[PDB]
């Protein structure tokens, strides 16, 4: 029968005023025969009617149906529960999935930028590293920049639970060694609910 997945908002969207966070609810493996899929959305068990259901998408003879509820930054950050309820003819009972933000004393991330290893400097591309540790909850966003322009050739690890109950991760921007040695400044931007304005920046240049 049909399955349900409920995804939380992108952490940057919950934390940034310029952005509008969304909870998304996906119903997969819907049959051609019984195609009607009704969604009901709840916020702390209170029905909300402002959701937006997108039309079916053949992903054979099987459809997918997505429903997207806009959330208020404050509601998410106050840890309110978002319940998505799915109905179908090929379901015995409706499916109910819930997500909220992880409850627990928030803890401020510590951001440390690390330059390349001496040994990596023998290579044509080197690794600028950003360590973010001691943050809770695990919802966080990391970006890189240089001279005001976004640096885009990076990858960030998922948060990892540390031994003290907080989280940590590493982001790894890759740059041509030339740009590093020429003494350009790079910035590691971190976005988290426990930071002032949900934002800090650490710099990293040649030393």
């Amino acid at each position: 029968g049909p399955s349900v997945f409920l995804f939380p908002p992108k952490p940057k969207d919950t934390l940034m005023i310029s952005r509008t966070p969304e909870v998304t609810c996906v119903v997969v493996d819907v049959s051609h025969e019984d195609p009607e899929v009704k969604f009901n959305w709840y916020v702390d068990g209170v029905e909300v009617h402002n959701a937006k259901t997108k039309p079916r998408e053949e992903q054979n003879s099987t459809y997918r149906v997505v429903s997207v509820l806009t959330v208020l930054h404050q509601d998410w950050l106050n840890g309110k529960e978002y319940k998505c309820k799915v109905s179908n003819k090929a379901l015995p009972a409706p499916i109910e999935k819930t997500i909220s933000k992880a409850k627990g004393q928030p803890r401020e991330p510590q951001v440390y930028t690390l330059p390349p290893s001496r040994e990596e400097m023998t290579k044509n591309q080197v690794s600028l590293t950003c360590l973010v540790k001691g943050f809770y909850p695990s919802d966080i966003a990391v970006e890189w920049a240089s001279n005001g322009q976004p640096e885009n050739n990076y990858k960030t690890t998922p948060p990892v639970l540390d031994s003290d109950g907080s989280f940590f991760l590493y982001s790894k921007l890759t740059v041509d060694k030339s740009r590093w040695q020429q003494g350009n400044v790079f910035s590691c931007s971190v976005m988290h609910e426990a930071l002032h304005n949900h934002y800090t920046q650490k710099s990293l240049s040649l030393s």
Binding site: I17, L72, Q74
Partner: protein, 447 residues
């Protein structure tokens, strides 16, 4: 299939023809010359006839009679070109589609002696029909009024008939009504008389297919019309049927303060000027100006494209209060905020307008996110040459010029003829604990 074949036509198929079956014989189309041409154009199978739904062009002096042409029930257009040996057209010979506005062209019909198009709801219509003896274009939807082309074509049909004998039916027309394509009034005026209706006064009436403009009284005169003392309109044809009902027509009114309302009514209490945009429901059909009394001079939003010079929140977000739109909002992580801005020059500010959180045209925003209380301000030092954050943040440099005390969706109030280059709008509180938002700020006056 059927939905695909509908697009694809550019189960057996509903329209066009049979699916790629007895052949067309003389039992369908007797005339060999006509049979040939129809086969070349529509198909060679019996089942094609009922389905073909495009154009058929019949040509040449070889065609004697048009029997079998009625079988093309869905034909969208019939062209009869140089059919010099065709002597009779009756409605039982033409296809059913002729009653639902299929197109009918005929040129060079020099042998035609009887032209019967009666009861085919023809909405429109002769120099080549020189052998005419009878015709019946009655029980159609024609406009045969004085200044109509269709009357002039009828007059030729009668002159053709009169050449052979004294057979000229043209009565019982039920012409269809249409909305006029343009209305005349580009500048309406009312006195300060203390209700007028913009639709009844300026955007009214019905036209025919030949653009003959008709109230009830004008329709009465239209029904009394006649050719050779023979009334051509159907007697049993009501005005209620002909007229357009103007259903779902809305009137959008922009005042001098650039405030918008939707109403066809205006009570003429004071001097005023409105811009009027009249909408059928999907499109604007008429624009005009409407001066009440002496009128009022159209204000401009002086704050439009204003430069942000400081704010307690995100600088980039503050810029969205001075675009044209209500598709994004400004807020802060708090119940208070301010944005200071620069109109670039000193101008006369007469009113201001704030579009609150719920005016958002992109996310359906609840009124609980509205700004409850705020103040619009001008800088004290009228002529200070700014070379800044600490200055603009400090409340002592600002004089209030307006107060907001209501969480209205749109808040408008008047200003005491304020001349100021630099302004600040402070949000003092929200309508709830949710951090207040707003989408647009206008400073309204003369340049």
């Amino acid at each position: 299939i059927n939905s695909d074949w509908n697009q694809y036509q550019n189960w057996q198929p509903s329209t066009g023809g049979l699916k790629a079956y007895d052949v067309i014989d003389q039992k369908d189309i007797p005339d060999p010359a006509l049979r040939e041409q129809i086969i070349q154009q529509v198909g060679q199978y019996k089942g094609d006839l009922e389905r073909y739904n495009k154009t058929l062009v019949l040509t040449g002096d070889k065609i004697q009679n048009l029997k079998g042409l009625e079988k093309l029930s869905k034909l969208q257009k019939l062209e009869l070109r140089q059919l010099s040996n065709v002597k009779e057209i009756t409605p039982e010979l033409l296809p059913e589609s002729m009653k639902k506005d299929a197109e009918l062209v005929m040129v060079g019909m020099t042998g035609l002696e009887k032209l019967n198009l009666s009861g085919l709801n023809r909405q429109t219509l002769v120099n080549s029909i020189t052998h005419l003896t009878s015709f019946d274009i009655s029980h159609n939807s024609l406009d045969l009024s004085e200044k109509s082309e269709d009357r002039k074509l009828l007059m030729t049909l009668m002159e053709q008939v009169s050449n052979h004998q004294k057979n000229t039916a043209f009565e019982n027309q039920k012409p269809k009504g249409y909305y006029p394509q343009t209305y005349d009034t580009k500048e309406g005026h009312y006195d300060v008389d203390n209700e007028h209706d913009i639709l009844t006064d300026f955007v009214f009436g019905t036209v025919t297919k030949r653009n003959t403009f008709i109230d009830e009284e004008a329709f009465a005169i239209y029904k009394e019309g006649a050719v050779d003392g023979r009334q051509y309109v159907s007697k049993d044809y009501t005005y209620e049927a002909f007229r357009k009902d103007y259903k779902g027509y809305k009137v959008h009114l922009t005042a001098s303060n650039l405030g918008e309302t939707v109403t066809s009514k205006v009570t003429a209490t004071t001097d005023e000027t409105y811009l009027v945009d009249v909408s059928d429901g999907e499109k604007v059909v008429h624009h005009m100006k409407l001066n009440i009394g002496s009128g009022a001079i159209m204000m401009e939003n002086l704050a439009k494209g204003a430069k942000v010079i400081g704010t307690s929140g995100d600088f980039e977000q503050a810029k969205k209060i001075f675009d044209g739109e209500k598709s994004d909002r400004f807020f802060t992580w708090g119940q208070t905020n301010w944005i200071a801005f620069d109109l670039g020059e000193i101008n006369l500010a007469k009113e201001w307008r704030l579009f609150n959180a719920e005016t958002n045209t992109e996310i359906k925003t609840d009124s609980s996110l509205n700004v409850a209380k705020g103040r619009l301000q001008i800088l004290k030092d009228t002529t200070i040459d700014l070379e800044r954050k600490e200055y603009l943040s400090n409340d002592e440099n600002w004089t209030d010029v307006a107060q907001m005390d209501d969480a209205k969706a749109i808040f408008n109030s008047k200003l005491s003829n304020v001349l100021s280059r630099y302004w600040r709008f402070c949000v003092d509180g929200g309508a709830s604990s949710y951090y207040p938002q707003y989408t647009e700020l206008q400073i309204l006056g003369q340049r």
